[PDB]
């Protein structure tokens, strides 16, 4: 009865259940302890069923990382895409989304941590990182080029400025998860807005 | 058979050192969730009878490693501030240089920090190592940001919030160097940090009040 019952679920639903089991096992066991046998016992499905769709642990883990990062990117792109009057309203919309409960909640931190640990070893995972971190900076690069044009800053290295702002957001996201009482989500927005003020006040010059 | 001259002969502080390094190697290979005192002894090359006997458990070995690692970073970062030209910007620049030097930018330890940070949420003792050491790291940066503000002389600068911003930037940059060393050079990381200070000095320090 397991061979039919999993299979009769909708594709997006089968996929979501396996990624949820991969995430739970990464939390409990770390990347090195996750196995397809654990993931399938967590999911409540047969291992033979899964061997057909996935190569192994690396493939399951990569699909989970792809989905989590895809989700972030949709919320952040959505925030920009619905923002109005130009570069700073767009950055603000981004900063607000970044420190919303959706993105700031540390539920998945151990997963992220597990993902980041596997980046240096597994090409499948290393590639998801490079792709997603580049997609993420490309979004900031766009709005920073827009901001430079408004400025209009002569030869602004938007790529390096994007590495700066992404690093700040990352650092704030991480510290927040390690202890949420260090600063409030609103202080997080305020810090990011101060960084953009800093550029408009003349720091753009340091970025070529 | 080298717990005989590798553990038998040494002082308790020198066997602590050995255990700290076995704990870090075990964390890099098994993760925190997968590490155990047995797997720690497997790295030390000594028996687990021995180390049960002399130690409380895994949580306590990992907290000791965490304390050693953070202690060392802080020594080096304090050193760089103490031996820099007296002024606020030269002290910050020395901090940035130390931060992106091969010693603190060593990607080998990334795995160790990742394992500590995962233990922070579920093990309160590790949590408390985090809070304390992050507290000390920021206190160092608040002292020099206050010097900066006084040189400036900025009326009501929230040097505490400024220090959270700057620590966040450093953390973020350190993490990206380790996840992909090709993204930007150590020189560029310094440059990004100086650019942040420039930003403050250019007038962004005004946002640090509300």
From TrEMBL, chain A:
One of its GO terms (biological process) is regulation of DNA-templated transcription. Transmembrane segments: none annotated. Keywords: DNA-binding, Repressor, Transcription, Transcription regulation. Signal peptide: none annotated. InterPro entries: BetI_C (IPR039538), Homeodomain-like_sf (IPR009057), HTH-type_TetR-like_transc_reg (IPR050109), HTH_TetR (IPR001647), Tet_transcr_reg_TetR-rel_C_sf (IPR036271). Residues 35-54 bind DNA. Residues 12-72 form the HTH tetR-type domain. One of its GO terms (molecular function) is DNA-binding transcription factor activity. The keyword DNA-binding applies. This is Probable transcriptional regulator. It comes from Pseudomonas aeruginosa (strain ATCC 15692 / DSM 22644 / CIP 104116 / JCM 14847 / LMG 12228 / 1C / PRS 101 / PAO1). The lineage of its organism: Bacteria, Pseudomonadati, Pseudomonadota, Gammaproteobacteria, Pseudomonadales.
